Amino acid sequence: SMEQVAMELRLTELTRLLRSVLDQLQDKDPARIFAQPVSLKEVPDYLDHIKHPMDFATMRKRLEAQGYKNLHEFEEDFDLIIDNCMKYNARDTVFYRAAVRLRDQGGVVLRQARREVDSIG
Numbered sequence: 001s002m003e004q005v006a007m008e009l010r011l012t013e014l015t016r017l018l019r020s021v022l023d024q025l026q027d028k029d030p031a032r033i034f035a036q037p038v039s040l041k042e043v044p045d046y047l048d049h050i051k052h053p054m055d056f057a058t059m060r061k062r063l064e065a066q067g068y069k070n071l072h073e074f075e076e077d078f079d080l081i082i083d084n085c086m087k088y089n090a091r092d093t094v095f096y097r098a099a100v101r102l103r104d105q106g107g108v109v110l111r112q113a114r115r116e117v118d119s120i121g
């Protein structure tokens with residue numbers, strides 16, 4: 001149907017917009033702390049602590065399958081990256097502090113993304 005096609009074009013355009021958001025967020029992580037999954041071969045105890053691991057490569061795989069239906073879903077995954085890091089790592093660490101700075105800088109990007117998603121429909 002044409003109605004199905006139109007819904008598909010919309011998911012594609014959301015995907016485009018979320019790609020540009022993901023790129024802008026990931027620029028705020030020049031150390032690439034959040035680029036890849038925590039390896040269970042180097043933090044063997046990770047999954048005892050963190051139930052839903054998340055990282056930018058994992059988000060990118062989902063995005064490329066058009067797996068985010070709305071900005072809320074994408075934000076949930078970004079928040080997991082930050083929140084997981086702030087739990088596993090202590091306040092005094094480079095990791096915890098990198099998550100704080102990512103959250104702060106990412107807020108700006110997501111504020112405007114919400115306006116664009118709402119505005120364009």
Ligand code: NA
Binds near residue numbers: 090
């Ligand atoms: Na903690």
